[model samples]
Every structure is written in structure tokens, then in C-alpha cells.
Target: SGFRKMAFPSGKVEGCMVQVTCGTTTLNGLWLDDVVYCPRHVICTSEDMLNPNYEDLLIRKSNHNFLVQAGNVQLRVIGHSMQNCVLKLKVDTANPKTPKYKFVRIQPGQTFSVLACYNGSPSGVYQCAMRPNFTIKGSFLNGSCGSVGFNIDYDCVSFCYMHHMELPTGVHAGTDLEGNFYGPFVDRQTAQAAGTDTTITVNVLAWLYAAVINGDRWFLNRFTTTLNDFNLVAMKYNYEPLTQDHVDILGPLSAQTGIAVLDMCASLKELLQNGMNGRTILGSALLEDEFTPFDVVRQCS
Candidate 1:
């Protein structure tokens, strides 16, 4: 009763919404391993993803490998992949030891660009994808996290807290409950999901964070049916801790959540792999890490 039935369909979508070339598979009625079934407006890529459109611009974040180069005091970020991402940093920066401030958030696509900034000097030096950009310029820092974004973003900090926050991966392309990585809170946890009380609290915060902080009402309007069991317990809890169950129930309540909307594509039997015996991996990984916006998700909101 709490969720919008259409999205639940015969299955669930469990990944963040992103822009990409597009699908494969149909487990539980949702499509997968196929792109012919993609929603409106977006043009499916020959590869199997959808392109981000103006409609989602305000809330769509660029989460991909980027070309962030340091030239004198100015920092330039270039788009590298199919997805768009944001890079936050500071500028007018004078020195490192004595820091000062500003906040600029940069969002860039292969052909587009968005800007975000940080405060004071480099809290950390600028790092690039899977490695360190290392060069700290101006009060300026880094943006468009890859391996580079993290080297600049911090600690108690790195992958340690990512796991704790339930955001999982230790890289940039990932996001928080609100679906944005304004960067994790360096301090204590923000939402206390100790039991059902905090569970509901964090869920509500996910709604509010999308509305209040991210200002995406459609995102807030999106519903989920995961039914966190913890929602039946405590209140006024401290620390946003997730129980294994707490972790399970969490959802943005939207198709972006992975399994929620996957069925929208074709099924495994229809995939390119249908003919070939796909062997084990070469072990090669993405330089950008997680959060590949490969689906063209529809909205019930």
C-alpha cells in the first residue's frame, strides 16, 4: 500500500538513475540486457544505455571518468564518458597552510559542463581517476571524483565510512540516500537508522533530502516498497547505523533502485550473451568505478 504499484511491476530496479549508452534481461517482468524498451525522449545508445535529457538536468549528476587538469591556478574539468558528474571545489584560493573559502559545484558531460566548489584551500590534494592528480592549485581543490575526487575529498574517512554510511563503494560515482554525494558527512552519521524509528527517520530524510537539499520533488514523490522492518522500533536514536535488515529495507523508492525497473528491458535469454558462452572476467575494471547511468528510467511521479 505504501508504494506505487507500477514501479514494482513484476520486479524492482536497484541502481541509481544515470545517463549512458543502455539493457539486457527480464527477471520478474522488468527488462534487462536490452534497450529497445527504453522510456521516451532518451535516445538509446547502440551499446545499451540511455542519454540524459534536459528534463533531468537539475537533478542528474555526472558520475564518470573526467579530464581534470591543473593549469596554473585555474582547474579545468573535461567530460570523459557517457555519464555526467559533478566536481565541487574552492577558488580565489591563496595559500595552503592558511586556508580561506568558497563553494562551487561543477557538473560536466561529454559535451556539457557544470561547476561546484569547496571551501578554503585543499583539504586534500587533487587526485585523478584510480590515481592521484596530486597537484594542489589555488584555494582550489578537486572535482569530478574518480580516484582523483577521493584523493581530494578525506578520512576516518575514505572507504571506511562509505561502508558505514551504506553508500558502499569507496569511489565518486556512488551516492547517498538522497542520491547525491554532496560528499559524506565528515562528522557523525546524519540519520540514525538504529531501528525502525531511525529507519523511518532516514527514509523520511531520504525523501526530505531529495526535496530539501537536492530539491527534486519528483525524486521525493517516487515511492518504494522495500518495507524496512526496523521502521517498527526506536526513536530519537543517535548515529545513522544500518542493521543488516536496515540495510535491506533502505530504498529511494524509485526505479533507480536497481531491480525495481530492470524488468523494463529484455531478459537474459535475449542478451548478446544468448548465443555465446560468456567466460569469466579478464578482471579489468572501470577507471571511474561505480554508478554507471546506463538505464533510461521512467517516472511515475
Candidate 2:
């Protein structure tokens, strides 16, 4: 599931992780009390811990600094300590499975260390962890060490589940699609009062706006971001606290695509309700179908 909403059947946190709704407009911070797992210790020798010597795979850093060791973190706005922490991970290990990320609470003069094992890569295997935020523009380290499969009990951060999600390929392309609108609209908006116009834009926004909003994950996520931005803009121009019935939307583009169809229906509903100009202005060229549930389009309504 592409970031399914964490639900509680008994209406408790027991069945799943307390999901953090990750929308630009939705980071309505919640209490993030990190759970405690067995604290990890990495025991490796300069050569003594060598299963083949893949120790370079180890990383260490923390709130003040960090690594590939282990601990706990998340919504750590808990216990009155919103203090920052560090994350650690090691992909190559003697164990059959990869290890989980860790958080180290910084202490005065603390030189973090862990007792973990790294079963080395084959001689000349040349490997290192993929750097975060490289966004495919480049790498902090590279390897043909091959594909890694990481799963999360639940997604907390974008990369919390990247090991399994394969880190998003087009990180900003979707946001950029939204930017195509906001950037120009904002820029020309000042000039537009004098009658300057801004419109025509490209690839992603057009594709999705035309494709019925199924431009894939980034598209859906970006769609939410764009909608959020638009809502804010509407407020800025006195769309005021907003019309009580203003359309609203956001998403994680679940691997289970069924739920997303509801979003589409609402989108269609707005175009249909707002008159032909809504259709023309928003790119509704023709009818795909009339059976789409309109008012039920958004659960929020």
C-alpha cells in the first residue's frame, strides 16, 4: 500500500502505527513518542570483526552529529523533549536481513558507537550507502551492491519506507508541476491587477489534469500540494476563510488505487457543478461519464 492511512479497528493504536498525514498542509504535528526497541550495539573489529570486512557500510551520527547503528525516533515531540536525534542504518550485514534505522539521543561529549556486524562485501565489491536528498541528481556514495528491499511497519517520514519504496525517482517534478501554476500566478497576480495574464504551462500538470489526475504517486502527492497552495491563495485574495463548499483534496496515492477514484469523482463534481466555464477553465473537454458520485466525491464533505 502506498502509504495507507493508519486505522484502528477497535479505534486504538494497537492494530497499526499512528499514521502521520503527510501533506504540505497536513503536518498538523501530533505527539511523536518513539517506541523503544532493543538498543542495538555494533561489535566489529578493525579486522577482527571481518566476515570479509564490509565495515564501511556502517554509519554513525546523532542529534548533534550521527550512523548505521540503531535506536528510536519519531514525533519525538514526546516527553517534553522535541530535541533532534540522529538516524543510523547498515544494509550489508552478516545477518540474513538488513537492519533498521536508529536514533541516538545526544548526550554531552557523546561519541556514539554501536555493537553491530557488517559481513563484508566480496573483495573489490566497492560499495557505500546511497546518500539522502541526492534526488538522483547525484550520489554521496554509489554501488552495484544491488537492489535493497526495505519495508516499514508504517510510513512516518518519506524515506521511512524508502527501502521498500525505492526512494521516489522524481522528487520535485510533481511539485514543480504545481509550481508551474503557483509561481506564475503569484508573479503575474501583482501585474494582473493591471491586466497581465499568466497561463500556458507543461508536461506533468497538463498530463495529469488531462489524464484524470492519475499521473502516478508524485502526481497525486503534488496534486495535493497544488490544491493546498490554491486554497491558501484563495484565502490570500479574500477567498476568505473560504467558501464553505470550496473543494478540497490531498493524498498518498495508495497502491490500492480504488480510494483515489473518489478524489477523481469530487474533482469531476466541481467541474460539473461550477458551470461550463469551470469545465473550460479547468480543462474539462468532454464527458468521460456522468455516473461519478459528485457530493460523495470527497469524504471531507
Candidate 3:
């Protein structure tokens, strides 16, 4: 049990983490829905479900039709009601060509900002809140929200892998009688031995990508649980094929593969380096697009 328990929480946490208290009422927990909770640090209008004045702690606004805007982030209205109260926020970005914000990741203690249009106008309270490690600030934007747009101000702060000779502690380690290694690894050697190997890494990375795109966090504790002793990288430098599973995660088979191939390759190479002390895996492409025992992953030393 030498492995240290991860500090981050599982699943995901987005937006700023804050406890905005008005009188005795305080905003707490990971807010998701409009009727139940509100996003942290975001100033919800009095009419919004989250800010429903249970004790008259929120400011009553005549216009609930204000648009929430942030830098490069899209604000969507949730629930089909004229009492515009909820916002469904998402990132609006592209990776070279297509929108691949899903490839982004974030950790706690990071800082960022969001802006809200006060009743179609850019003048309102400048609210700020801080979670245990992370912080977020909000300010009013200028210009009228006449079915038009406002500006964004993002001052964000932020903050890999190997295959195993032996699995880290607290995890199952060592080899079995099959003349094959039995442990967590990204190397093709172990991946071939285990029926379900890279799935954890692939899924977790995808989850991280989602977090990054949404400016969310994947707690360290939960993340460490998915850690493997040996890791592999992914990317496509040559015109080689890949496993269907890899293809699915990489996206479309055409140009998307181009980027994903590189991703997979880099990941594989890096994983090998970590496990084998900066060793190299000799391969032109990543894994074969079809089934093959000669996957470059198996070549890791």
C-alpha cells in the first residue's frame, strides 16, 4: 500500500466553488440543476430557482431575461420557462479544425472569471467567491444584450504516465503462471495479457477531456484509483491502422484519426519512457487498425 490515496474527488466539479451567504442563507454543494442548485460564484437573479428568496436574501430583478456571458464559454438557458432562471454553461473551442474542447482538463485551486448581463445591460455587482482551493470572480459587462453579444475576460490559472515493471502499492501486482505479467501497464505486453487493460485509461482520459472542456475538476482521490502502473501514449505519425476501440475514442477515421493517432502514439511513447527509463518503442504507427499480436505496444522494453 505504498501508493498514496488520490486527493481529488471522483466524477467532476465545474464552475467556481463558493459559499455565498446572504443573511443566514448560504450556497453550498456542487450545483447542477436550476430548480435545485445554482452554480458557485455565479450571481443568480432573484427569480432563478436557486436564488428563490426563502428569506428575502436575494435582489429582486424585474428582468430575468438577462444573458450570462463568459470568455469563450457558451451560456445556455435551461428549462422552458419565461422565468429565465437557469444557465447551462459549456466551452466553445476548436482544436485546429473541429471543436474538441473535450480534450481539456482542470484541477482544483485554479482561478477563473465569468460575466453576467444585468437585465440586458453591463452594470451589476462585482461578486467574488473562493472554495477551499479554487477561486472565481464575476463582474458586469458593458453593452446592451439586444440579441447581440458581450465580451469575455478569462484570467485562468492551472496546473502522465508509465507502464509497469511492478504495479504501485495498494493495487494488485506481480505476474501469474501464464508466463505473462499481471499488473497495470500501458505497454502492449500487459495489455495483451489482460482482457480489459487500456479501457480504464481511455475512459479516464475521456472523462478528463470532458472536465477540461467544461472547466471542471476530477478530484485527485478518485483519479488515483484509476491509475495504472504501466502506461502507454497514443498518436499517429505514420499511416498505420488502429484498434476499433482506439478509433472510437479518437473520433472519425479520417482527419480526426490524424490528431488522435498522434495523441495515442505520444501517449504510448511517453508511457514506455516512464516504465522503461526513456526507452523507445520501434513502430511507424500505433496499434494495428485490425487485430494483430505485433502491436507496437508489445515492443516496449
Q: What is candidate 3's lDDT per residue for 1-301, written digit by digit as tens?
A: 1111112221122232212222222332112223212222133333433323422322332123323332233233332211122222222222122211111122221111212222222222221221111212122221211111111223321210000122222122211111122222221112222222222233223322332233322211211111122231222222212345544543532132233433433443443334434322222122212111111111111
lDDT of 1 by residue, 203-245 (tens): 2232322222223222222323222322222222321232343
TM-score of structure candidate 2? 0.15
TM-score of each: 0.18, 0.15, 0.19
Candidate 2, residues 1-301, lDDT tens digits: the string is 1111111121111111211211111111111223211111121222422241223322321222112122222322111111111112212222222223322222111111111111111112111111112111112122111111111223321111110011234211001101111111121102211112111111112223334333332223312224444445333322222121222221322122433433443343343334344333223354321111221122112
lDDT of 2 at 1: 10
The candidate with the higher TM-score, 1 or 2, is: 1
Q: For model 2, what is the error of residue 183's alpha carbon versus the real structure, in angstroms, after optimal superposition?
A: 17
Candidate 2 residue spans exceeding 4 A from truth: 1-86, 89-301
Evaluation by TM-score, superior candidate among 2 and 3: 3
Predicted structure 1: lDDT: 0.21
